[PDB]
Design a protein around this ligand. Structure first.
Ligand SMILES: OC[C@H]1O[C@H](O)[C@@H](O)[C@@H](O)[C@@H]1O
Ligand SMILES: OC[C@H]1O[C@H](O)[C@@H](O)[C@@H](O)[C@@H]1O
Ligand SMILES: OC[C@H]1O[C@H](O)[C@@H](O)[C@@H](O)[C@@H]1O
Ligand SMILES: [Ca+2]
Ligand SMILES: [Ca+2]
Ligand SMILES: [Ca+2]
Ligand code: NA
Ligand code: NA
Ligand code: NA
Lengths: 145, 145, 145
């Protein structure tokens, strides 16, 4: 319908406005079709997953250098490491996304991972590099939508 | 159209993202299809209605236990009673929503209401129970959209 | 489709909810189909344009008295002048929007503009009136979407 087109125009405009306000005020970061945001809290891995899922999203995980840089900027902004959305396989050294798929893009800090299976989780340093670590530390909660 | 379907997908995704960010940061609470939010201000009944209507919403009113609990959490978060969207009928003891319909769900604190017609408004204690009270007190402004 | 209509209803409702929350909390101001918002930062003209464009919007510019009043309220809220989206033509005294079109609506403070071509930018005083000024001062960044 000619009216359907105009209705969609207004809808898209309003979305742009709301997303623009959130972006301008630093409430969220947009990279491609992914949106990253934090509540500023520092809690453990399980708690982060819960906070994100409750908000309708998921604990963040970078799959491209650009996405990695975005999360890194948030970690730097709050000066704290960030737990990423991935866990170690049965075979130490190998990690998978929470959906089970094997991790593709990686940005390990030189020498990592080397937890020998004792560090199932992955944290991001403020410079963007990763380190396998235990899952009970308090880390900045960053979600992706 | 095949293009209409994809366009709608993106629109729905963006809405999820914006709602997710607002939710994650505690800017609003979602219960079913209703959204509750506050500006943190404590003013009287008439002022609250104005603030909500100006924002495109209405002074909040719970119609289910779950909705009641949501508003109660906000009242507890700011440690202040909340005026609800309802007023006393001509017949003391009977209350109606601002649209005129008789109140169905209620959660009166034991013994309430007992203002004998001198307390036309309804405030929510931080534990979620209600009390009929005058409309000139300063209460947390909670709106529903 | 009957389903397309219902899907659109929900979409429009959600947008109203998100816009309502942003409005209630003072994150943005809505005037007609235009949305104004600020990140609270005070920087020069070029920096403001960049901040706005990066957020998906543009440095604000009022085209009606109502739009002017909205921006003025933000300037007053933060107690700081606001750079507007317009620059002086080659012919001193004449200004155009950043798209090149000649400025229509104006609200110059009595006597302005009188920079004689040395003040290419336009700033808004907290009372809403304008003054042509250099573009290197630090002014409140207000964007429109
Ligand atoms: O605290 C654990 C942490 O300590 C150091 O940073 C390194 O040995 C890391 O590989 C290890 O994960
Ligand atoms: O301040 C008025 C308020 O006082 C007490 O809380 C009770 O008597 C309530 O029923 C009444 O509404
Ligand atoms: O600082 C420059 C500024 O000074 C005064 O406010 C007036 O002369 C203005 O016209 C001029 O733009
Ligand atoms: Ca390690
Ligand atoms: Ca009472
Ligand atoms: Ca001047
Ligand atoms: Na390990
Ligand atoms: Na009463
Ligand atoms: Na000039």
């Amino acid at each position: 319908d000619e009216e359907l087109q105009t209705e969609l125009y207004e809808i898209k405009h309003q979305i742009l406005q709301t997303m623009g306000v959130l972006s301008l005020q630093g409430s969220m970061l947009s990279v491609g079709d992914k949106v990253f945001s934090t509540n500023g809290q520092s809690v453990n891995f399980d708690t982060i997953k819960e906070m994100c899922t409750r908000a309708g999203g998921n604990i963040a995980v970078p799959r491209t250098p650009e996405e990695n840089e975005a999360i890194a900027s948030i970690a730097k902004k709050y000066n704290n490491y960030v737990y990423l959305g991935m866990i170690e396989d049965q075979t130490p050294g190998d990690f998978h996304y929470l959906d089970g798929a094997s991790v593709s893009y990686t940005n390990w800090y030189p020498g990592e991972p080397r937890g020998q299976g004792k560090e199932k989780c992955v944290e991001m340093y403020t410079d963007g590099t990763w380190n396998d670590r235990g899952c009970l530390q308090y880390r900045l909660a960053v979600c992706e939508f």
